[PDB]
Amino acid sequence: QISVRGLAGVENVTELKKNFNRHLHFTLVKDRNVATPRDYYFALAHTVRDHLVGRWIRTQQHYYEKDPKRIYYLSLEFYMGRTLQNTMVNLALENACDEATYQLGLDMEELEEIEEDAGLGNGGLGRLAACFLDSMATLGLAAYGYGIRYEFGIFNQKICGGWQMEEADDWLRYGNPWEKARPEFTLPVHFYGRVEHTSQGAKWVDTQVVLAMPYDTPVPGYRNNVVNTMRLWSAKAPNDFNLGYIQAVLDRNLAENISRVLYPNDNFFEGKELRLKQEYFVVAATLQDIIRRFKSSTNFDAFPDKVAIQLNDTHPSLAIPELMRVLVDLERLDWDKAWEVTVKTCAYTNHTVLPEALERWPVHLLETLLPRHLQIIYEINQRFLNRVAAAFPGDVDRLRRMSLVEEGAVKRINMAHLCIAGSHAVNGVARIHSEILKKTIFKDFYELEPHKFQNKTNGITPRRWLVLCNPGLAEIIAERIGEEYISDLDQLRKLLSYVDDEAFIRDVAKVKQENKLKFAAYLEREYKVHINPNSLFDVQVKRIHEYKRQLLNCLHVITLYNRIKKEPNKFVVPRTVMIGGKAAPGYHMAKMIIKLITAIGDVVNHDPVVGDRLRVIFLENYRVSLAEKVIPAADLSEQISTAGTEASGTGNMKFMLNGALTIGTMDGANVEMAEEAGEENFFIFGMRVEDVDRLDQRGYNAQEYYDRIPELRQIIEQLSSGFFSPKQPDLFKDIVNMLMHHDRFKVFADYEEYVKCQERVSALYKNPREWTRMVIRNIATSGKFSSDRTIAQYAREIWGVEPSRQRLPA
Amino acid sequence: QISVRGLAGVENVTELKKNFNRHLHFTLVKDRNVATPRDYYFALAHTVRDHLVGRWIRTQQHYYEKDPKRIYYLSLEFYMGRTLQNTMVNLALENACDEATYQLGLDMEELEEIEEDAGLGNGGLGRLAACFLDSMATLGLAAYGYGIRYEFGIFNQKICGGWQMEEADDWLRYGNPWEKARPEFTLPVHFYGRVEHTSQGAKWVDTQVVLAMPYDTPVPGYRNNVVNTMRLWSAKAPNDFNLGYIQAVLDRNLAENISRVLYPNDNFFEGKELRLKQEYFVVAATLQDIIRRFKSSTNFDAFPDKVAIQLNDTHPSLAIPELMRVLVDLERLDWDKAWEVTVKTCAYTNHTVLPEALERWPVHLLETLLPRHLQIIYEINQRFLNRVAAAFPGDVDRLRRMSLVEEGAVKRINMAHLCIAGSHAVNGVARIHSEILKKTIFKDFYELEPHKFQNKTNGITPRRWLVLCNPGLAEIIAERIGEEYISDLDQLRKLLSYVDDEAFIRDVAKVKQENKLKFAAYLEREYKVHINPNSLFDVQVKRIHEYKRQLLNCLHVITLYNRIKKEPNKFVVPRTVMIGGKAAPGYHMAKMIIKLITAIGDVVNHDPVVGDRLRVIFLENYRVSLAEKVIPAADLSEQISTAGTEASGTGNMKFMLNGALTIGTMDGANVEMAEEAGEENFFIFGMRVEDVDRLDQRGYNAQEYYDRIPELRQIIEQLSSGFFSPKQPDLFKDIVNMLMHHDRFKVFADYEEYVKCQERVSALYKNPREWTRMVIRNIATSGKFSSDRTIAQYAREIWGVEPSRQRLPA
């Protein structure tokens, strides 16, 4: 049908058709009179997976012969989403399968809708890990993702009476065709026990043993025949475990609970034991596998030439003491040499500067659960503090600020300080975020070791985030400039010579109109909701957090409503305002924000005076597959975090790539986006980082904005007096109180400038042609934000390996 | 190689070979340089399973069109063992796969050893269920096995310092290729709640919901292209379950624990809630499936013409109140009509008369867990007691003896009384066992309804228990009489005309010698043990229970030892005495017996005076696949339960079929075996049932035997004084005490006659040729004991359906 989707050759189509029937019969044990759409989906998933394996086996074989340096990406989160279409795209099977399934009388798109998301992450950090695996495979790196096979991923979100309800994400109910269990590669992981000192060194004994069983999932590169591996560990009890006989069998669940469920608290730290167990489990099973693969190549001097381990934040920070542990206690290297190897092996990426997000584990926890690792940590700290003492003699305050050990009420290990001490590189995730690390929370460490600190601005994969979700935009691009930009996104710059091209203008706008039509219809079919597709689609989708200021969006929405009520017969650019995102289950404030959003919708969507000029929708269960649908449909992208709080963001990049304009603050990667497109092609408003600092110094008094801004005061009074909650007039007292007395994120300070900049957007929107030319200028400068660029910078500047676009043979 | 194993055609072999490679590559994702024997086993298991599915799909389709009466066999136990070879045998693929795997350079037998047993049962009762499914498929009945997919089967038995240790049977670690998950057919099962009375009848509300998810396993008939289904339910939590968010997810295990583990207590009842939950779960999920299949054919009058449900003992006795419940509460039939339908649908088989084995559930349990079913039971009882009152007016003692409700300390429901009241037929499992039910525990019920009581003597399948495990005996039989006896075991009678045939004599004996050689070598390779294969192989294998009197065997063994020590230089027929079997984990006495057995081995096997004349081995982890190996190798079968206690036995039948002679009491089916072979061809000793009764009347005084039998007294003194336990002289005081003061099974009363009959066996053994002619006379009369005979009697006399040997088309 469309060209970027590949060839439907008659040999290929005929082959797909018969493999499909074979799987239906043999694998599913169904015949065509009993099959449901879910059987058909499985039959196609099995047929497409058959194309991977040849390539999978030979990619692994190729790495055995060439023995290149191996990259290990350790993360507790891989936010994968659906695998079927992505696999078709990367293998160039998409049109062939479309054709093969049409001939069998099936609609492929309807079958794609049946696949569950692999929701093994919370948001930005887990999705970054997914884009990275894709980019790594596309660039030919010998790279392995390592994580945990959670049995339940991020919860499904249901809204009842406008409140979030959580329900278990049972993503494996029907099976996962993509994974291959490898119980033959099971490995023991130890917990508890005690430390014994022999003549022959320290020994860790009387441990409980949990088994780690790996499942491998293939990661196909883009059309290069590379298939890398994502290995996820599952927890299993050993067989002599506890060994009521009955009760003993039933208590095997205590061990297996380690991999049962993903923790849904993203931007707040909770020091729960089960969480620490998950962190150690993935780090211990992974390092053993790494060391085993290395030994099939005594001399650990070569280890850092053959291994890079990247830590995705501090979740796997225990890789550092664990690698020391294995090198010192089991392989008998001396301390200093083991340390050299560790530092040269490990690298650490930080993803936030929010104080309450940072991991700080109570010492009494580590002491009970990992008593050897605590000893190793104390020894690391001591040697580290002696380098500090020797470079800044007499600076006793530096010593306590830099310690890995925090003193106080309860002593804590600062996991971030551990990663910096034990890694040869530390990077932030956007230029401004990396500068902030150097000037604020890691200032001391940077003064000690300036050479460790780097920036690697985030990116997203253009395979999923353009080709897969937005085939019509990919197609009109490919008409003018060819297909090569899919693996070289810098080529989109060539689109700048089409900015005054009348045909391209009409085509970019036609694709947007189509995506909006399609999405309007998805709203009606699957959630009974009536939207005007001629309205500007104003979208804010991301996890619910105070720093992300969905509340500021709320205020703008209420202002627009109050302006319509004031002058009903005046023309306004109509909008559909959509906000979506999950709240962490114990984050009371986040839950209240969701409730306000739906309460505003209850009022606004039913005012006959408003008409179809303003709609407010809460998008339920935002997740990767919902992102693939709403992002192509958006006109306006809301990225409106308080300057200094969003480390990077990556949603912002999805929307720039798919033809929405951006309203936001100079935060995170928004700064680099504007700088690439030009400040004129972006809607920038609000305090910069410097202005926030000036405001903290003097004190933030919210009362001042409330006294000086009549439109703000009216909204506050409405909130307080029960305008949006007629039956519980005081429903929202916590929000108003927070806004008035302890808003760490200064919602009111950005309010005026935000409302004003929002009028500039409505004005541009009234002139379709100039709106579209600005779109074109965004899409055309979006190339820097490809995760291929990102990964090639990690490869060259941290891992010491060269990317490669060369095909392996088919 | 051998003819009963089928053709190795060149088309077939070439086809198997390539399907094998396809599975290795595509299914296992391995290549030949990485594969382990376990990968090869899987590749063959997948290749053979592909031959089933065509036949599976069309057998199910055939039942849809013909709509025959359906049999539902409900059991909590299916003791399946390995599936690979059985499947090859029944499909006639055995020689073809042998050939295909040899050409790939593999040894098929070595691959067969890798398959885990499906140990979803404890012993006789669970294995009967397995033989029955096989016979049902072979006789073309539209029959379904329904049970529970336990995640852990019967425990693996390890002996340490001569004690049983139990360890978890994790039979699914590596996957089960035979099963197909059917999550699309998941069904809700309810627990707890309360009963509400409306105008429109009773309603069961506020229940907890557990989901039952079915897994289907194919059951191939012998060479008839019939493939029936075994459906086993697994427990799953619903998704809004409990719905710490975290704790809520982790508590999903409480619901799923229902199918976690098989209860290993066979011949003792424990009233634990988890057990009652397992019983209700399988009965509720199964009846819904049954009713659903029936409705795709309002008029429940036809239900009993379209459905038979067989209850394998009282484990699924709740089918009765549950069927009432659905008919009365949900379909709104009136009581009397629902009762008629229930009675005509259900049939009950009893498998024991041991009082402590019978299920008697506390009313406070049923009241909490199943409060509607208790109401239904009270109503059943009342109506039942009114028929009793009216037929035996004034017999108030009959009324309390027959009540379903036992009065006392705690009130209990007698589940056996419920099955008899709610079933149109009640059968025992051997002729003498069925007579005992009529004369003793069910005398009252028989006087009320003589027409319900039947006998169906047990049988074993000659596919697994001859062809599969003893190919060399099957072959020499097939040379003389052809192959037809495999599905018509009565044809073995034709072997009587070979009893004086010199060649047949030498061949029967050659096969026995070969099986012994092979088994001697299995002992050495897999458990470092040195046996003389020229000794008589004296075997007792079965669960460890006092009634089965492994202790009497112990006494004979010690007597033989003491006789050798007394006259060392006298000739004795050498024996290898092997005893094996698991003990229920809380059955202290059973555990002590195992310990005595190994302690006797420690003394006897190391006495240089004994030489290789007497060995005592304990066979560890006896289970179905160990039975397939030791039974062909046996010369002497020990079936020595106290008369009246072994309802039938089925091991006895395995050994008769495979050429061992039998020493035993006139118990269970031993009586019918002797009667079929002739009493002269069997070693019968000991009290009959009548003699045991005469002894209870007068009182059993064990002291009397101890005073009158010098050889017995010596053994007792050795036991007491620490001869067999030098380091704990009083280790065995419980055993001696039990033997002396409270032996419910009268070990000493049978001792003299047992030792004497054992000398008659040694004497026959000294004359090889006459030993063998007696073997031939056993094997030749073993036909009655085929489970095909058994099932054809259930079909004709209980289910109302005709068996059929006709092929379905290929």
Ligand SMILES: CCCc1cc2cn([C@@H]3O[C@H](CO)[C@@H](O)[C@H](O)[C@H]3O)c(=O)nc2o1
């Ligand atoms: C102790 C670890 C805690 C943690 C940090 C953090 C950061 N990010 C996001 O990681 C994304 C990937 O770098 C960034 O684009 C976003 O700005 C950032 O908020 C995220 O999604 N969740 C993570 O939780």
Ligand SMILES: CCCc1cc2cn([C@@H]3O[C@H](CO)[C@@H](O)[C@H](O)[C@H]3O)c(=O)nc2o1
């Ligand atoms: C409440 C249910 C309890 C139960 C009865 C019982 C009987 N049998 C065996 O069932 C076998 C199958 O009928 C018979 O050959 C054996 O004699 C008999 O002991 C068995 O293996 N286990 C069962 O436990």
